Amino acid sequence: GTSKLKYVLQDARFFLIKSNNHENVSLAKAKGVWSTLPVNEKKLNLAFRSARSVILIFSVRESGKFQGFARLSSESHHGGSPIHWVLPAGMSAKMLGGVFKIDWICRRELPFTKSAHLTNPWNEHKPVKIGRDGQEIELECGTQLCLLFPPDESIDLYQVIHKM
Numbered sequence: 001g002t003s004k005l006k007y008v009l010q011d012a013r014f015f016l017i018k019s020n021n022h023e024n025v026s027l028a029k030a031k032g033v034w035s036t037l038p039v040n041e042k043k044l045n046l047a048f049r050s051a052r053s054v055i056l057i058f059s060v061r062e063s064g065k066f067q068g069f070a071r072l073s074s075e076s077h078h079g080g081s082p083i084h085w086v087l088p089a090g091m092s093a094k095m096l097g098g099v100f101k102i103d104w105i106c107r108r109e110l111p112f113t114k115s116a117h118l119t120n121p122w123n124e125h126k127p128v129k130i131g132r133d134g135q136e137i138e139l140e141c142g143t144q145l146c147l148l149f150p151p152d153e154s155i156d157l158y159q160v161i162h163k164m
């Protein structure tokens with residue numbers, strides 16, 4: 001069913017995450033962590049304190065798809081267990097130094113062709129697939145986007161709900 005999912009998304013905030021490579025999204029799915037540039041790191045830490053759930057919706061550049069979505073379970077923290085991100089061209093390990101813990105809600109893909117009817121008011125009502133890394137997605141758009149993903153029957157949202 002989808003009732004617990006809708007409960008988790010209630011009054012959530014949503015942010016688009018754009019990764020330059022698949023390897024880092026695979027690492028994030030394996031380890032439950034994400035790192036972004038300092039400008040977006042500050043936005044996510046503020047959002048984490050402001051909302052019952054902060055949802056990251058992931059898309060690998062040039063893939064034509066979203067690869068899943070996850071809920072922040074912490075603010076960013078430095079110095080914990082390190083992470084071997086595959087660093088793009090203009091990217092240093094100090095830029096990805098802040099590590100957020102995340103709980104995956106859906107690890108399944110959604111092609112951009114399926115979200116063509118959703119536009120994001122916070123990005124000039126462009127299709128929700130359009131946006132830079134860190135772009136916030138308005139509540140109703142983000143809720144409908146997350147509900148379009150195939151159900152991930154491997155995930156039990158009971159433990160996620162308790163963190164709220």
Ligand SMILES: CNc1nc(F)nc2c1ncn2Cc1cccc(Cl)c1
Pocket residue numbers: 018019020021024034035036037085086088089090091096133
């Ligand atoms: C583990 N975190 C990440 N991994 C990868 F691969 N791309 C990321 C990323 N966070 C953001 N981007 C997009 C981006 C923005 C500006 C400049 C570059 Cl070079 C890449």
